[PDB]
Symmetry: D3
Subunit: 282 residues, 6 copies
């Protein structure tokens, strides 16, 4: 049995960039089929409605088991429109967002929607005087390293792998949909790191990443004097570059102990596991 | 006038991940509208045909000025199917690929297709014993840093910004479509770096990135003994992590000279430019 | 001529550690004379009363133009007892503290006391399972580097030096007592850095340092499960270590531009200035 | 029993900055009480006399079990005056100093004084053209990191904790006073590091720190041409920065082995011990 | 007992620099005696003939069991003249060279010569506008670190040591002459590293080092525009510097596991072995 | 005119490894011809005599303008034998050695010999339990980097190039022979570095390198307990590794200012100069 899902991407978040690929890392899974659609970085109501309409049009013939909408701020006008539309459909749906989505957690539960809110997936320093295409890619590279090496992406992988198993049995109820809020403390109960200083460095990285959002918000929405907001948004990006270095340090500590956790998918979808470098995943 | 384009993403390449977002980094461009569709990491003929069918179905009402297909190896069976389908349509199209696409350069020109082949966008170490979702994200983070900080993404941004200006006048001929092959030497004629050692470090990074592909190919397709191919594909990822460090070093050298090039888009689409940190882009 | 002051130290703050020495770095100023007294790390009301008693006791013959009380949380029982005793004395006083001091900011202005509150001077992870003497010294070394290389200590040096001048004019009124709150944004109003990225890295260092406090507070006072609070306080120390590294990176950028600001004292007390390494300070 | 001591600080040494704090890192010991006095950085005969007078006057009602004088060069005029005054007093006393103190080791033994001479606690590059307040704080941050992470501060902690136990017998014989000389080779007799390379990197850091003193002395007291002495004193600071980086590397090695030694004090003064991060100190 | 050999050095290779010293690291072996002769960096046929003449001249009385010729490109005119003269002599010979030596591999086996071709021993960026004496020494330092820390020099040490044993048995036949080609994959057949990531980082270092050669060749012999060839040769040197850093990182991983392999010679010549730092070599 | 010289190498010193190569970095000088002979690492009286005999025998027909003997400790038995033999010969000669050579500086002057004594060229940690071939190569790679990047090799290059010009007069007076002692302070009289912090970091690297010798001597010739001497010699190597990192940092600072001094030789032997990367050497 093959699980099917549609992913909708409007605006950009580190987790939404990677969400679907974390589920079939080598494209050799025989038990899933996905469609991805979106309006690139635009996330205003008009564009989001168009993205969701594309998804629901495709859904008629594709018959997805679930639909995922990912992008910044579930509480903003565009994303709110996607929530209304998905909540109004027959398809089980999950919203992937950032910390600002906490504001509409109750609304989503009432809408029968699942959610994964990633607090360290911080908004970048989006002022024209600082953020050009290259800087936007450098920041996303640092954020991707943080979310991957700290183990945050493994939490997302697990949540979706569980939903995929239920999708195969056409047994996805509203109570099966995730209601997750990820942050620094999430790491305390993961079996991610064998070395404790790796866990602690990873936690420091996620704390710094979560803190970057407040700096970006101050420089993009509060401060209006350019002589002040340009340095402010740039400082947010310097923070994120150091958070990636902490995440890199944590991973190198696991390498020193030959204890790097790897959880690849088998062709039939089963999530395997290994720690030692030369050990086969099982 | 608003330029419209559809991006199709099958399989994953660092350049295809970012291609559309490099054109509207803060989502405030009033002169473009994009639709993005794809089948995630799957790039076999069946999936690619489905992705292209989605795009062409959307194209009827969306009326794009051009269509872009991005993903690994334009010469593989799946991508070749996309090339046939796009070549058979009325829509000007561009193929974004990696070095293996060089094999079908002549075919694409005969098909009336543009192309941007990025040699340093290297295939990862895709063996199940090593590549799990987290490792696949860490590698992509390093590759994204390399492609961004060396200036490769600025070359892509420029090529598409030129096509967008022509799209606005509905004047995109086959001769206007790009025919670009990017590698280490491309950097020699860019006005990217003010400091020469930054350029030289960026070139070293792209050379190492291009070389990673041969290692990944050896470990994934040639070597069949796991005691040998697992270390081989892992060594490819260690190379890419050092290429990202070189790219980071180049950018820090530009920072030391307060000469970091930034080329953000104005709301009307115009590509602005600046070097000094406190200088407004113009 | 020759101003005099008494410094009282109870508990420890990075700023209180260095405050007096920042005013006579080579012990060759002839316009100042200082006395330092305290009860070491203890800062309970009994111990703080004893410390101010010592200060007030020696003030009788020493005759200080002003007295300084420095240590953590001026809102706590111990430090509050000290503000009480100093406000009702015949010597103008200044309170050096950290962010919690903001709770009693107005109360201090009402008491006729001066103050310098350093937000980035963060409480450390004071849990017995983690913080031994060596770890405390390591954390203080990192904090000392942050406060010094970001330029925060220069702001403090300048405040006390201006007061030392007002004091020589035997006219120290309340309107002369400093009323400073120092944080990341303090750097925007300074000319500390010639290189813009050095200032932005220094800002990021101060933001991380300020954020360390919330983590230490959670681990010391809120979280009660030791499997969680030990990793939490350690993650605060890993954050500070990276803040120290950003501060170091900033200073190295100034070195690359041969623009390290140095403001040494002359024997008469005047603050000289220089930027180039081989430039005499004027 | 509650042991009591008075610490006198004139001039600045890394060990004198931290000595008292190393004995009650979280201020929760109920078996000790300290008073700290001094004249800040000034250490001339006049100031040191005043410093010891304050101490002796306080000693009257405080009734300490021992007195500690810490500062650079026990052989200089001021410190020599302090040695005579303390040697003459009724209180058992210990002198904390640097390598120049070796010149009067026999003399202190005849004066009935204890001593802890720390060779790596090197004099800084005190030339006006180079050493301003910020540079002095940066140097001290590096030196503190070296003395902490190499284990030197634990040697000092242990010596005083041993004396405090003796004091609880209200009988400190001259025989009980420490007579220690600490340097690179001190580590060979300790079990500070579980990893041998961490021990040898720590030894290299202490050797470099010890060697800094000779460079500082040359630039401050021998070389008279500013074109030569400013570079000489700055080179001493670059050496101390790298010593701190070596000490940091040693500690990260202990982290990789989850073997960081921690020896916190219990509320009753007992020194506990632990190696594994998640293990309770016992 | 006491084997003898003559080493001839013309031109420079990292391996030829170190080959003889790797056999008697502390100059205390009593089973070997060596003579070294050459014409420095010159390797033209006239200079190489003179060097072999010296060797053959001293061989008359010295009576070497074997002669070694080491330097770049055994396929070039100069080195070919040396293979000619050595193959037609009464002393068994071995040729140490780099990758270009593969062109004449069969030709050398036909000449009855032994060989050790080190692929990672890459030609440097020998253009006058870039390579001065200091840059050449820097490049050689990085290459020397790569060849040593990755374990390549141990492979070479072992080849010559086994030959030295065959030589003492006065039975050195052609079947005893080494026929080695060393590259990244050579490490897969060794037990050099206890930590798997140290071996993978060492493999990546050797792959980058091998790739440096193609870049140097392009800049020195193909590219003719100086605005392009100077950056090209410099990028090859930046690559080697990162290869040296990966090799260093690998060695540090072995240190973290206290597993640095050491194979020192005993006075009698037997190769001892040890892994733990404090373990006597047996 | 074609100057000729013979280099004799017994034992190993960093300066003796590179001395001849520093004079013809690309082997294109047509004004010089060299012969190099030696006994590898052995430097006992027997071997050194044989070494000088080879040289003197070759000198007959070669007819060099001067002879150079390079190796550790000019004062040891073997080197002393070489000094006597060369002093007695008809050829002007120069002795290259390390700091122990200072012991016979007056003697060499009376022997009519020139000398270049390099204090930072430190003896390595030659204890069997620690120094195997790989460790020796690693140490030498770090030392080479220090002597190259700090500018010491340029001092040596210049001294010999000055002597070669004299030799082209077929008249080298004793007065023409170099009498140099190189150490940290040598940099103060050079204009090697455009950036002053690069100069002081290079000075710090040479100081650390010079200080390594004393640690090595202690572990090799003074300390007899293996539990103490193995850590001692390994600590000397950790110091040299950090000295190399400092020298690397100095060079990267020159790169940031596009001010890397390069002084390549022209085909006729003239020494050219350039600072800016893209500028031709003149
Ligand atoms: Mg439903
Ligand atoms: Mg409902
Ligand atoms: Mg169910
Ligand atoms: Mg067409
Ligand atoms: Mg056509
Ligand atoms: Mg046209
Ligand atoms: Mg439990
Ligand atoms: Mg031109």
């Amino acid at each position: 049995t093959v699980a099917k899902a549609i992913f909708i991407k409007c605006g950009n978040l580190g987790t939404s960039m990677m969400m679907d690929m974390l589920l079939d890392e080598r494209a050799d899974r025989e038990d899933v089929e996905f469609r991805v659609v979106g309006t690139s970085v635009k996330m205003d109501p008009e564009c989001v409605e168009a993205a969701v309409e594309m998804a629901l049009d495709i859904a008629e013939d594709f018959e997805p088991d679930f639909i995922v909408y990912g992008g910044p701020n579930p509480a903003a006008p565009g994303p709110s429109k996607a929530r209304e539309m998905l909540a109004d459909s027959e398809y089980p749906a999950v919203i992937i967002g950032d910390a600002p989505g906490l504001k509409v957690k109750d609304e989503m539960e009432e809408q029968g929607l699942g959610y994964i809110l990633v607090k360290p997936d911080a908004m970048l320093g989006a002022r024209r005087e600082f953020l050009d295409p290259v800087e936007m890619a450098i920041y996303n590279a640092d954020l991707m390293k943080v979310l991957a090496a700290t183990g945050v992406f493994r939490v997302v992988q697990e949540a979706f792998d569980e939903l995929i198993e239920k999708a195969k049995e056409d047994e996805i109820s509203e109570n099966d949909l995730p209601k997750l809020v990820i942050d620094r403390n999430t790491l305390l109960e993961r079996e991610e790191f064998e070395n404790p200083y790796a866990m602690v460095k990873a936690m420091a990285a996620l704390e710094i990443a979560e803190n970057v959002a407040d700096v970006s918000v101050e420089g993009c929405f509060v401060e209006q004097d350019k002589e002040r907001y340009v340095p402010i948004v740039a400082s947010a990006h310097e923070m994120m570059r150091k958070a990636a270095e902490l995440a890199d340090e944590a991973r190198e500590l696991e390498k020193s102990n030959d204890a790097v956790l790897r959880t690849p998918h088998a062709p039939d979808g089963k999530v395997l596991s290994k720690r030692k470098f030369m050990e086969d995943p099982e």
